Amino acid sequence: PRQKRDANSSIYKGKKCRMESCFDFTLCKKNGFKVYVYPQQKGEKIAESYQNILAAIEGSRFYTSDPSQACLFVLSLDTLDRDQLSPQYVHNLRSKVQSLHLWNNGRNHLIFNLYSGTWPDYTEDVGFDIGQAMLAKASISTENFRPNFDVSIPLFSKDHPRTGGERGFLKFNTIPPLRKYMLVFKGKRYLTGIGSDTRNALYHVHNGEDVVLLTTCKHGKDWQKHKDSRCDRDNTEYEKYDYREMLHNATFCLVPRGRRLGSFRFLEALQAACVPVMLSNGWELPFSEVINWNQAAVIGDERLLLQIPSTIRSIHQDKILALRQQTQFLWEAYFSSVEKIVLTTLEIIQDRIFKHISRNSLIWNKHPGGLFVLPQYSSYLGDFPYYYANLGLKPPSKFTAVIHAVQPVLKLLVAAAKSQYCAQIIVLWNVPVVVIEGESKVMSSRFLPYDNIITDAVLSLDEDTVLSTTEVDFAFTVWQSFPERIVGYPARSHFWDNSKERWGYTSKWTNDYSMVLTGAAIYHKYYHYLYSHYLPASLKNMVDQLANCEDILMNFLVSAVTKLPPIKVTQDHFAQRQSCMNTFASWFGYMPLIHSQMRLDPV
C-alpha cells in the first residue's frame, strides 16, 4: 500500500532515482508549470553558454520569480564544464551549492551539464553531489542514464544561436538522394587514451571514392613526438579537402566517439542534412526517450566497424529520402537554437507530471513538433489541424463565427448566418447567436480560447468587413484543403529596408503577400490557445498598449508553426506596424513570414 510506496521512495533515493521516488509532484499540482532560476550572486564568472541557457529559461513562459510557486529549480552557477583543466571550471562548487537555502538536497532541481571528467578515464564527474537533482547532461552513457529521470541534451558550441534559426541546408529535395560521396569523416585521431580505438581503424574502411575518412594525430605535443608509422601518410591525405565541401556532398556522415561520447559533429550533421551514422557505443541520443532516432539517423555498433559500408549501401533509396527529411525536421524543431533545446528539456520534464495530459510518440516525431503542440489544449490528435493525413479524419465541416465589436454589423450577422457551414455566432462586446460580456477594451482578447466555441474552425471577422455568404462558403471549402493555415481575403506583405535595417510593412497593391489579416480570415481554434499560452506576455501587452498588431502577431505565430505562407482567397497608426514587426522578429529570432504569389479563386 502506501507503506510500499514510502519504502520504495526511501530505498531508491540514489543513483537509481526516478520521478515517483526522487521528485515531489505536490509543488506543480496545476496546469501552470513554473521554473525558478536562482538569482546571480555577482561574485562568480558566467559562461556565455550557461548565460544563454538561463536567458532561455528566464524569457520562457515557465519562468517565475517566486520560489514558492515553482516546481522546478535551475542553478545560476556554471555547471556546463566540469573538467578541471578547462578555463570555465568553477572551484569550491561542492560547498557552494550546499550553502544554498532552496537546495533541499536538490529534490526538484534541473542541472545542465555538457562536459564531465578529467584527462584520465573521462567519467561523469559533476564534482558536487547532485543528490536528487535530475541532470540534463549532454554525453550520457546508457548504463549511467536514468530511464525517465534525466534528459540527454545535444552538445553545442558557445556560438550556437540563442534565439535565431539557421534554416538548414537542404534547399533542394533532389532525387536520387545520393551525393558525390557515400560516407565521410574528417577529425582528429588520438595516439593514446580512451575512445580512439574506432578512430584508429578507419583506414581499413577508407576507399577514397565513396567512403573517404581522414584522420590526423596532430593534437598537441605528440605532433612529432610519438607519431606512429601512419601519421605521415594520414596527414598528407588529410590536407586535401575542406570538411565543409565534403560534409554537404555526402549522403551519410560518420559520428564516432572521441574522448567523450557526445560530439560537436552531431548538430553539424543534422544541419548539413547528411544522415548521421553513430558509432559511439552506449550513447543516449539527445531526447532519445522522446525522439525516435531510427527514423532520422543510422545506429551501428563500432565493434562491427569493418562491414558498416555494406550495411549503409544496403539502405534503400526511399529510406534515405525519409531519413534526410526527418533530419531537417528535427534540426528546425528541437536543435536549431539554445532556446529550442532548453524549451525541449523543460517540456519533456513537464510531460512527466501529468501522464494523462501529455504528447504521444507521434506529436514529437512529426511536424510541427511538440514545442508548438501543447497537450493542455487536448491530448487528442483530431483537435489539431496538423494530423489529418496521419489519421483517417477529414477536416471539420462546421465553423464558428466570432465577431469582435467595439449598421453593417447587423447585415454581417445575417449574411454569415445564412451559410450552411455556420453552426453558431459569438459576438464580442468590449443558428444560436451567443453574446459574451467583455470587461476591457483589449483588442487582443478576441484571440482568447472560449468554451462556447464547439467547432474546430473559427471565422474571425471585424464588424466593418462586409462579407457575402457565398464568399464565406468558398473560403471555408478552401480552408478544408489547408486546415493548418490562415485563409482570408485581406492580405499584406513585408519587406527589408536597407536604409534603416528594419522590417517594413506595405498594404497597397503589392506584387505578393506574406500576411493575411484576421479581419476576414478562417483558422483553427487551437491557434486561439497557442496565441495565449505560448506567446509571452510582453508582446501581447505591447499589442494591447498600441491598440493594433494582434493579427500581425497571429500571422507570425501561424507562419512559425507551419513554415508555410497564408493562403489568400478572392471572389501614427501606420508607423506602429513596423515597430510591431521588428519587435516580433526580435523575439522570434528570424522572420517566419514567407512571400507567396498565389491567390485561390472559385471555378
Next chain:
Amino acid sequence: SPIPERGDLSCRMHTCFDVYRCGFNPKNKIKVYIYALISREYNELLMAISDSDYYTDDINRACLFVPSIDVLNQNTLRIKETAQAMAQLSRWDRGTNHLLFNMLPGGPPDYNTALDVPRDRALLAGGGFSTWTYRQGYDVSIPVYSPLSAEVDLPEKGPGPRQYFLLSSQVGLHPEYREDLEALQVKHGESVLVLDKRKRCHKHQVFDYPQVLQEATFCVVLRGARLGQAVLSDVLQAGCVPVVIADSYILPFSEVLDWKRASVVVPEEKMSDVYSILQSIPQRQIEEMQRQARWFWEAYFQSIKAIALATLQIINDRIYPYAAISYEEWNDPPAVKWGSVSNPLFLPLIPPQSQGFTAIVLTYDRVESLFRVITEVSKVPSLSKLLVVWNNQNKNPPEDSLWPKIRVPLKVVRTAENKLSNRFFPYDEIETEAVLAIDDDIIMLTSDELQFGYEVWREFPDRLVGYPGRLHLWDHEMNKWKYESEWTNEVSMVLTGAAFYHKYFNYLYTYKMPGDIKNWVDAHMNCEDIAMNFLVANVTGKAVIKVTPRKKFKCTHMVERSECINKFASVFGTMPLKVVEHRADPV
C-alpha cells in the same frame, strides 16, 4: 553445480550483447536457436519460435538462444535447480545472448518485479517490469497471457455509448483500493461499478466476467501482485479503455507501442481524482482509445505466438535499427493503415528560384507541332533543361540543325520500345526537382503561363500542379464512375500534359505502382494522366492545384476514360481523388 551471478542492472547491449554473432545479412532478421530438452503455454511459445522466419539450425550461425526450460511461472520454479540447468546449458557463455521468457516475476515472500534466478547477462522478456528492475535497451516488456483470450471469443462490438463509465473487476485487492473504489461509487453512483469475488458478484447482482467488461467505457487495472495483471488483456479484448493505477509499471511493448493513445495511466495517490481525470476526456478520444486497445489485443495480446513474434521483432529492431519497422505500422489498426496517407515528401521546403524545371516533351508522328511548342517553352525563364522523348521507332529523329535555336541544353532520348509510359521514367539527366510534362497538341500556353505555373509549384512541391482540368462523377444508373470534362464546377484531376510535379512521382510511377496499372496502360496506349493523378492522390493524400482560368488548351474516347477510371478505382480498393472547387491565379 555451478550457479551464475545475480542479474546485472548495469548490463546493456553495447556491453553484454555479442554483435559478432549476427553481423549482417540481406534479409535483416536475426537467427534464433532452441536448445533441445514444459507447460502448454511454453510449448506454444517454442512452436511459434520454430515455425517463424527467426528459427535456424547450425548453432554457430544463430544470434539468439531460447532455452527449453519453463520459466513463465515463478510460483513453482525451484530457482536453484533452474540456475543449475542454465549453467549446465553447455552454451551459456555467461548468458551473453540467451533469451528468457517470463510473465509472473513475483515471489510469495516478496515481489522483486524481476526474475529471481541468477541470469547474470541473460536477456529477459518479462510480464511485469518496474522502472528500477527494467533495463532500457536490453529488456523487453511483454504482456502476461490470460487463457480467456483463447477460452472465450467476445463479439467484436463496435465503439459507442455504454451503460457504465468506470468499472473495476478485480479479485483480492488491498483494502485501501476497495475503500477508495467504494468511496467513488457512493460519491457518483450508477456510473462507477466495482465487482467483488469467472463470475463477478455485485450486491444482489451477477455478471459474467469476460463479458461484463463490454458494458464499460473505462476499466480499472490495479497493482495487486507482480505489478502486472492478466486483467489488462481482457480489458483490451473487451474494448474498454484501460486505466492503469500501478505506480511504477512499464506497460508491455512500451518500447514500440504508444499507450498514450490507448490507455490512461493515473498514479495511485490520485485515485479520488480518477473520475475527474477521466471526465475531462472527450468522446472522440475515448472511441479512438477503444479502437487502439482492441487493435493492440488482436495484434499482440491475442496468443503466445503474437507475444513471441513481437518480442523477437523488437530484439531484431534493436540489433538492426536501420531495418527496423516503423512505430506507425506498429500501433495503427488495418483500418487506419488503409485510411492513413504517410506522405513521403513531408518536409515543408520551398525551393529557390535559382533552380529550374526539366520540361519533358512527348511526340509521335508529329514534328511540325512539336517545334511550335518547343519554341514557346524554351522562352520561359528558369527552364533549366528540355528533354524530348521520341516514341515513333520506325520514323527517324529530325536533323540536329533542324532543331530550333534555344537557350537551354537540349537532349533527345532514344526509346528502346514504343510505350507511352516511358515519359515517366526517372532520367538521370534530370538535375532539377520540378518536371514539366507537356504534349505536342497543347499550344495555347504563354511564357508567363508556364512561369506562373512553376511559381505555384514552388509553394506546393509535394503535389500535382496542372493547367487542364478534368474530374470524376458518380452515376446511380450505372453504379460506376464516369470521366467528365464538358463542364467544370469542381476538379479532381489535371492532365499530365501541361503539369508540374516532383521527379519522385516519376520514380513512383516507374517502380512503386501496383503491378496492374502500368502493364494495363502499356497495353491500352491511354490513361497515363489518370494513372499519375491516382498515384499522386494516393501517395501524397492531397488535392490537385489547377493554375489557369482556361479550359481549351488545343486548337471510343470517353468510354475508354471511364473504363480507366473504374479500373484504377478497383485496383486501389477505393477512390483516392479529392474534389476541390478552387483554382490558383496570380494576384
